[PDB]
Scaffold this active site. Structure first.
Site, PDB file in Angstrom:
ATOM      1  N   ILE A  16       0.790  -1.251   0.000  1.00  0.00           N
ATOM      2  CA  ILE A  16       0.000   0.000   0.000  1.00  0.00           C
ATOM      3  C   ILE A  16       0.836   1.323   0.000  1.00  0.00           C
ATOM      4  O   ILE A  16       0.342   2.366   0.404  1.00  0.00           O
ATOM      5  CB  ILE A  16      -1.101  -0.018   1.118  1.00  0.00           C
ATOM      6  CG1 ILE A  16      -0.656  -0.765   2.380  1.00  0.00           C
ATOM      7  CG2 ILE A  16      -2.306  -0.766   0.644  1.00  0.00           C
ATOM      8  CD1 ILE A  16      -0.487   0.068   3.598  1.00  0.00           C
ATOM      9  N   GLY A  19       5.316   5.956   0.504  1.00  0.00           N
ATOM     10  CA  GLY A  19       6.222   6.219   1.633  1.00  0.00           C
ATOM     11  C   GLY A  19       7.505   7.008   1.419  1.00  0.00           C
ATOM     12  O   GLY A  19       8.201   6.800   0.441  1.00  0.00           O
ATOM     13  N   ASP A 138       5.389  18.329  12.098  1.00  0.00           N
ATOM     14  CA  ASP A 138       4.769  18.074  10.799  1.00  0.00           C
ATOM     15  C   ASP A 138       3.274  17.803  10.962  1.00  0.00           C
ATOM     16  O   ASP A 138       2.732  16.893  10.296  1.00  0.00           O
ATOM     17  CB  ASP A 138       5.464  16.910  10.036  1.00  0.00           C
ATOM     18  CG  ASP A 138       5.149  16.925   8.544  1.00  0.00           C
ATOM     19  OD1 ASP A 138       4.849  18.007   7.980  1.00  0.00           O
ATOM     20  OD2 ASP A 138       5.141  15.838   7.936  1.00  0.00           O
TER      21      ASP A 138
END
Ligand SMILES: Nc1ncnc2c1ncn2[C@@H]1O[C@H](COP(=O)(O)OP(=O)(O)CP(=O)(O)O)[C@@H](O)[C@H]1O
Length: 276
Positions: A16, A19, A138
């Site tokens: 998935i 990254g 972040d």
């Protein structure tokens, strides 16, 4: 102290992987049948220069930060794998907050919006109570993972993606680049110091986006230098809707104060959000 997992303590299910330093996979803990997302480190000899190959520095930081964090509203690190180096994280099943808010035809109902606001506040409260405090640096809607959108769920939202995070007994510093989420003292230069109070400003923008379903500052368009100057020197902030409950309006406005000292401690934020 993080557990080591072999190859045969985990079985893969599928990939998935959008990254930052390798792939992401869904799998399972063979013991539990706990569902699990596995992030691998892949240097990749060819494409990257020497400077870019660390980026081993980021994977390492993320491991070190996560290793001490254990709270229901923070994505949990289960273990580490080797060959290749991998983080084995709890799998959070309902995507992320950014993509959910894009579905305008199905707005999130108010009681679920308050659950999300409070869950994320509890995770940052926990971070800021660490000694020394964790600075995520972040915080933005793509890094809020949704466990469930049922308003009676144990956990609806979790804070994720601590790759840029700091936990120092010193002053923290470094220029941050996504500017519509980042505190003004972090966007002027590499040059100036700041604290966990920079995350409290980002949390204000997360409250804003949950409240409105809209991206912070998307109502303005300016070239990049002028946009930064307006946020830093002219107090530019997104417009809070006139129908916002006044206690929520005050929390947002205090949390995005230009003066970091005026942004409240999370015990105050949590109390006020619990009264909405
Ligand atoms: N713990 C987890 N649970 C469920 N899905 C996860 C997950 N960790 C990562 N993912 C999934 O894998 C994909 C890649 O995630 P990653 O953690 O690398 O975010 P990212 O690096 O894309 C943040 P951004 O792109 O905004 O800089 C995500 O889009 C998400 O679907």
């Amino acid at each position: 102290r993080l557990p080591t997992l072999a190859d045969n303590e985990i079985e893969y299910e599928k990939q998935i992987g959008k990254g930052g330093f390798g792939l992401v996979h869904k799998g399972r803990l063979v013991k539990d049948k706990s569902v699990v997302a596995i992030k691998s480190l892949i240097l990749g000899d060819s494409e990257g220069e020497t400077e870019m190959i660390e980026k081993f520095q980021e994977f390492q930081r993320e491991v070190f930060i996560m290793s001490n964090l254990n709270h229901p509203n923070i994505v949990k690190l289960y273990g580490l794998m080797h060959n290749p180096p991998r983080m084995v994280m709890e799998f959070v099943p309902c995507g992320d907050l950014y993509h959910r808010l894009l579905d305008k035809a199905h707005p999130i109902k108010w009681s679920v919006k308050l659950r999300l606001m409070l869950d994320i506040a509890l995770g940052i409260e926990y971070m800021q109570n660490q000694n020394p405090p964790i600075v995520h640096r972040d915080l933005r809607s793509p890094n809020i993972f949704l466990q469930s959108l049922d308003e009676n769920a144990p956990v609806c939202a979790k804070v994720a993606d601590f790759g840029l995070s700091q936990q120092s007994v010193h002053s923290v510093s470094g220029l941050l680049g996504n500017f519509q989420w980042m505190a003004p003292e972090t966007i002027g230069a590499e040059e100036e110091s700041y604290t966990e109070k920079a995350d409290t400003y980002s949390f204000a923008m997360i409250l804003y986006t949950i409240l409105t379903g809209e991206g912070p500052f998307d109502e303005y368009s300016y070239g990049k230098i002028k946009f930064i100057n307006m946020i830093r020197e002219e107090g530019l902030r997104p417009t809070i809707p006139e129908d916002c409950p006044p206690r929520l309006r005050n929390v947002i406005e205090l949390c995005w104060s230009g003066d970091p000292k005026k942004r409240p401690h999370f015990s105050y934020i949590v109390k006020e959000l619990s009264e909405l």
